[PDB]
Design a protein around this ligand. Structure first.
Ligand SMILES: Nc1nc2c(ncn2[C@@H]2O[C@H](COP(=O)(O)OP(=O)(O)O)[C@@H](O)[C@H]2O)c(=O)[nH]1
Ligand SMILES: [Mg+2]
Length: 155
């Protein structure tokens, strides 16, 4: 079956681990994960990972979940750095990515959905708000990234 190498990036504390645990273990709170799921009918295995070893993992990774938290303006501002690093290490301008705004269950929002939608539009990538606590958007975020990887492999 097809294997998809995913890498989750973003500032500390945004919920990268919480998100992946919710996806894989189905509960709210390991540096890597491996599970078989069915996405759009295709059975596939998700291999997920949250200096030279970092670069190797980025070269191996086929899609990147770029995570900020809606209550962490710095983490949103840092997205550009993470995106630029991935493009540099992979030496490519077309890298499958999804922008994730996590912790959308919390009331302390400092990043407006519109800001994140505009950023994702500039990058040409999908944007999805998630909550690792309530599971809102979690499957959609990872499955959307897999769909982005497919389009890149087909087109
Ligand atoms: N309310 C809420 N807390 C979250 C969410 N995601 C993560 N957290 C909490 O944020 C803290 C940091 O999460 P963690 O997954 O360790 O962040 P990481 O450093 O990005 O891997 C923990 O206390 C989590 O329980 C979320 O969607 N909602
Ligand atoms: Mg973590």
């Amino acid at each position: 079956m097809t294997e998809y190498k995913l890498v989750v990036v973003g500032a500390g504390g945004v919920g990268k681990s919480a998100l992946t645990i919710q996806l894989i273990q189905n509960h709210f709170v390991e540096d890597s994960y491996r599970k078989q799921v069915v996405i759009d009918g295709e059975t596939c295995l998700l291999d997920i990972l949250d200096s030279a070893m970092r670069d190797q993992y980025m070269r191996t990774g086929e899609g990147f979940l770029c995570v900020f938290a809606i209550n962490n303006t710095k983490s949103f501002e840092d997205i550009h750095h993470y995106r630029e690093q991935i493009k540099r290490v992979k030496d490519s301008e077309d890298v499958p990515m999804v922008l994730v705004g996590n912790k959308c269950d919390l009331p302390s929002r400092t990043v407006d959905t519109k800001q994140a939608q505009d950023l994702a539009r500039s990058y040409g990538i999908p944007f999805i708000e998630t909550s690792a606590k309530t599971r809102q958007g979690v499957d959609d975020a990872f499955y959307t990234l897999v769909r982005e990887i497919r389009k890149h492999k087909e087109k």
